[PDB]
Amino acid sequence: TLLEKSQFSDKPVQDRGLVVTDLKAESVVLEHRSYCSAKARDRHFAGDVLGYVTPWNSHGYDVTKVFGSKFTQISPVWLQLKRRGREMFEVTGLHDVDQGWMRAVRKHAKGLHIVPRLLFEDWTYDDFRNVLDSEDEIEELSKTVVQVAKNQHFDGFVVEVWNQLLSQRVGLIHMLTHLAEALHQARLLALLVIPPAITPGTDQLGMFTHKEFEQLAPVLDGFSLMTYDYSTAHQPGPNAPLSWVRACVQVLDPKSKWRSKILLGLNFYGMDYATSKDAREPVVGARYIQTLKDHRPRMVWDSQASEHFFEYKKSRSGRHVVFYPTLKSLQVRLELARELGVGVSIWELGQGLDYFYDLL
Amino acid sequence: TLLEKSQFSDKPVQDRGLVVTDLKAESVVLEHRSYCSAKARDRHFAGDVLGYVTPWNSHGYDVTKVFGSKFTQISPVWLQLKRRGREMFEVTGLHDVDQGWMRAVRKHAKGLHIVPRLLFEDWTYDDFRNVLDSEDEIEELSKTVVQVAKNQHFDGFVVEVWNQLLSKRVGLIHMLTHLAEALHQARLLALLVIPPAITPGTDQLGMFTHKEFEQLAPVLDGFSLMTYDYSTAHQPGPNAPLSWVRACVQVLDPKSKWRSKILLGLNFYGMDYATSKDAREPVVGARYIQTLKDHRPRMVWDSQASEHFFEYKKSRSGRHVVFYPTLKSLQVRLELARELGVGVSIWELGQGLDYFYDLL
Structure with missing residues (x-):
């Protein structure tokens, strides 16, 4: 035991008194698979919602086909940006892009933007140095990225490079602005992964704060804000303390100028x-x-x-x-996002429970 | 057994190689009394510094006399403001105001503003409810306060009531603005004591943020920022971690409209x-x-x-x-205030080491 439904539902968990603080294990294992199929195409969240999909939790590919209408952006984790040599860049992992899958999720979810994650990998201090320093090399980097986007039918990319350097930025911000401009000129979207403004356990700001945001927010389309993974192995605790999450947004965009460009991070693992x-x-x-x-x-x-x-x-x-995460921990953060005027990004759509989507 | 200087020096500490990171206990006990009496009236910091003086650490009275020139404001901790009844207010503690002492410090430190601290004491929830809701009550409180400042030759006050309420929070702001306006009509200064933006060991924002700063910064002359007392008895640690101090200022005045009005707090105890x-x-x-x-x-x-x-x-x-605190922990925080464009408030001049003032 214990009993596990398998049939769909007439009403979504919110209309079934399921989102509660008084939770019983049995209630979860009993209902998790039973999502509201009849309303799997309706959106209960008004802001933008980005969903990550990875090849190693392939349940995500299926989730995306069923609940695609609930997403504004889907970002598959396949690509890496490599600098092979002076003025020579290469997008790797293209062997994982699934064109048939993309055709499917787009079929039943028009408007859905497929923006694959582009991870800067294997870069060195000098790679960034020689690159962030040459407008020429920056332009080459842009040509490479825009090409795989137009040839593979991607609506843009979710760039992950900012903490993936750890040197500290006027030069990094510069090649991001340029990249975004090149992307925009090709009618493509440009998003950036960014660390939480307040570093967990420290009461201090991290590497991406209002100084940086102010400069990039006007030019970039979105920001996948990692507002999760707050605790550590040595110091066990919650994934994302509600008020830390709230402060991480307020401290980043206090005057509420680009809230809708912020995709508040949520963990489904x-x-x-x-x-x-x-x-x-x-x-x-x-x-x-x-x-x-x-x-x-x-x-x-x-x-x-x-x-x-x-x-x-x-x-x-x-x-x-x-x-x-539970329906209560999720609904609470979707309300926070609503109140903060921000969007939501979910890492990732192969790690949670099916009836979670009833909330989106 | 330990050598302890007693005479003054020709040069301040910053020119005697005493502001170091690799400290030796005996060096501190040897140089603490020895300040540069010569340059005791020279300012090495160019933002406003506010100094507090309490009757229980009377050493501050003499400290203010000798180094009054290195200060822009001195706030004697003598007064409390009480609600005795409907539209009946009173300033207590007047028996502690030393007129001769004020005359003495103003002799050697002209252009120094004495702004006594006015602590709201014994106020009830109902007192607050009755006053923040009555325009008349506020007018009376204001007249009561302005009258003593005039009668006692005060340049204004440093008021302290914020942490006492905060649940309307907006009515507290109207009353401080009405008081500030009345004080200005009388040529007096109006400063407010405020808690740090990021609450220690919480990773989230506190009760006084940029939302409150936006509204009060225009009408108030200064903000005594309590950026100290970070650790607790259950969690021994530093008074005010440098980055926490920086973050509290950046998060409070992100766009930098009123840095000059922020008095970064430093602990001398x-x-x-x-x-x-x-x-x-x-x-x-x-x-x-x-x-x-x-x-x-x-x-x-x-x-x-x-x-x-x-x-x-x-x-x-x-x-x-x-x-x-040591010359080093202090100097590093003065350079921080310098780069944030803010001033500095010291609690309090009775608890430090004489040679600290060499730094300003």
């Missing part, structure tokens, strides 16, 4: 902490459910962090603590 | 922690120096917080950790 071993593992839907069945734990609602956690004990490992 | 007993006691200069003599501890530089700490054992009580 959870973390399973080994309290004694000072270690942790990420947990996706399949595991989460299995865990609830295996231990039938008591779900506790941390009203301050606004998340549910539960404890269980393994004979070998010891005592564990799990923080995985 | 330190905290002595009982590692195991979850306790602590504030430490003033006399006690700090005595401790260095009694244990001659190794001084460690916390490059992350930009502060010096040292430890010592006492079988009687237990292991201890002390966090007290």
Whole structure:
């Protein structure tokens, strides 16, 4: 046991009194698969919503075909930007782009923008140095990226480079502005992944704050704000404490000038902490459910962090603590996003539970 | 056994190589009393500095006399504002205002503004509800306050009531603006004490943010920012980590419209922690120096917080950790205020080491 529905639903979880702080394991494992199919094409969230899809949690590809209308942007994690040599750039991973899948998700979800993640990988201090320094090389980099976008039918890219350098920026901001301009000239979208303004556990600003935002926000289309992964293996706790999330937006755009360009980050995966071993593992839907069945734990609602956690004990490992999103933790953050005037980005659409989408 | 200077120097500390990161306890006990009497009236900081003086640390009265020139405002902690009844207000503590002392400091430090602190004391929720809701009540409170400033030769006040309420928060702003307006009609200054934008160990914003600063900055003459007392007895640590101090200023005045009106707070007292007993006691200069003599501890530089700490054992009580300001932790914060374009408020002139003022 315990009973697991498999049929769809007439009404979405919000109209079934399912989004509650008083949660029972049985309620989750019983309803998770039962999403409202009849309204799988309706949007209950008004802002933009970006969804990431990865090849290693392929359930995401299917989720996207079923719930695509609930998304404004879908970003597949396939590509990397490599600098092979002076004025020589190469987009790798193209062997994973699935044209048939793209044709499918676009068929039943017009307006859906497919903006693949472009990760700067294997770059060195000098790569950035020689590149951020030459307008020529920047232009070459732009030609490369725009080409794979037009040849592979991508609506643009979600660039991930900012903390993926860690030197510190007038020069980085410069090649991002240029790239975005080149992209825009080709009728393509330009988004940027960015770290939370307030660094977890420190009460201090991080590498991407209002100084940077002010300069890029006018030119870029969106910002995938990582507002998740707040706790660590050594210091177990919530994924994204509600008020930290709220502050991370306020501190980044206090005067509310580009709120709709901010995609507030949400995690669909959870973390399973080994309290004694000072270690942790990420947990996706399949595991989460299995865990609830295996231990039938008591779900506790941390009203301050606004998340549910539960404890269980393994004979070998010891005592564990799990923080995985629930309908309550999600709805609460979608309301925050609503109130903050911001959008939402979900990492990723192969890690959560099917009835989550009823909320989007 | 330890050599302790007693005479003044020809040059200030910043020109005697005393502002260092690699500190030795004995160097501090040797140079603390020795300030540059010559340049005691020379300003090495160019933003406004506000100094507090309390009756219980009377050393501040003499400190103000000798170094009054390095200050723009001096705020004697003598007054409280009380609601005795409907439209009946009163300023208590007037028995502590020393007119001779004021005349003395203004003799050697002309153009120095004495702005006594006016602490709202014994106010009830109903007092606040009755006053913030009545335009008449506010007019009376205002007249009561302006009258003593005039009768006692005050240049204005540094009012402290913000943390006392904050649940209407907007009515508190109307009343401070009406008071500020009345004080200006009488040529008096109006400063407000405010909590840090980012609450220590919380990673989220506090009760006084840029939303409040936007509305009060135009009508108020200054803001005494409490950017100190970061750690707690259960979590011993630095007074005010440098980056937390910077973040509180940046988050408060992002676009930089009124930096000059921000008085970045600096602590001149330190905290002595009982590692195991979850306790602590504030430490003033006399006690700090005595401790260095009694244990001659190794001084460690916390490059992350930009502060010096040292430890010592006492079988009687237990292991201890002390966090007290040094020329270095101070100088680094003056350069920070300098680069943020803000001023500085010191709590309080009775708790430091004489040679600190060399820095300004």
